[PDB]
Design a protein around this ligand. Structure first.
Ligand code: HEM
Length: 184
């Protein structure tokens, strides 16, 4: 279950965040920790496509090789806080699992600048029981978390020492697919 009402960044700049580019997850914290593996790869693109607010997601378990992409149109709850109904797709946007009620995530941008961000998500998927997931993002897939984003982790009353890094997993990403999936 999720337990946090994440607070969006004061003065969040939506056009800068949703600029069509890619964000890589460098570090994550799930508050139900046995909900996700301890070794993982994830990234997203975020942008407006023909007037519609979109994200494209990529997940990869580097041990099992389990791989999936998703596309969503985000709905606005408030600035920096969204509800996203997702469809599982191949890398080319062909639908594998259609949008369905009950398959959605919330998405809150707690901090962002041009290069780094801190987000919260709460996934809802069928009858699964899932927890709060925080992720540190960077534009550069190899970037160590800087003091701006680490300060934001502290300001969220979290300990960055708790976060698990994705950097030692040899993660390789198809940026081209993420960007193109925004239109799908
Ligand atoms: C960047 C933020 C993230 C978002 C918005 C997000 C969103 C999602 C969505 C929508 C699904 C369902 C996909 C589908 O069934 O079509 C999913 C599944 C999953 N995510 Fe993420 N995720 C994110 C980051 C992560 C990270 C960093 C991890 C590892 C900690 C993770 C682990 C998982 C796992 C293991 C599943 C499979 C769940 C299941 O079906 O039981 N996610 N995520």
């Amino acid at each position: 279950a999720c337990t946090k009402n994440a607070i969006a960044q004061t003065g969040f700049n939506k056009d800068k965040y949703f600029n069509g580019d890619v964000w890589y997850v460098t570090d994550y914290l799930d508050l139900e920790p046995d909900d996700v593996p301890k070794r993982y790869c994830a990234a997203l693109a975020a942008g407006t496509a023909s007037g519609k607010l979109k994200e494209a997601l990529y997940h990869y378990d580097p041990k099992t090789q389990d791989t999936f992409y998703d596309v969503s149109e985000l709905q606005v709850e408030s600035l920096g806080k969204y509800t996203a109904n997702f469809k599982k797709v191949d890398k080319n946007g062909n639908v594998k699992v259609a949008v369905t009620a009950g398959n959605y995530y919330t998405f809150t941008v707690m901090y962002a600048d041009d290069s780094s961000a801190l987000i919260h998500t709460c996934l809802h998927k069928g009858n699964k029981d899932l927890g709060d997931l925080y992720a540190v993002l960077n534009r550069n897939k190899d970037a160590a978390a800087g003091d701006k984003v680490k300060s934001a982790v502290s300001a969220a009353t979290l300990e960055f020492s708790k976060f698990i890094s994705t950097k030692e997993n040899n993660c390789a990403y198809d940026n081209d697919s993420l960007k193109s999936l925004l239109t799908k």
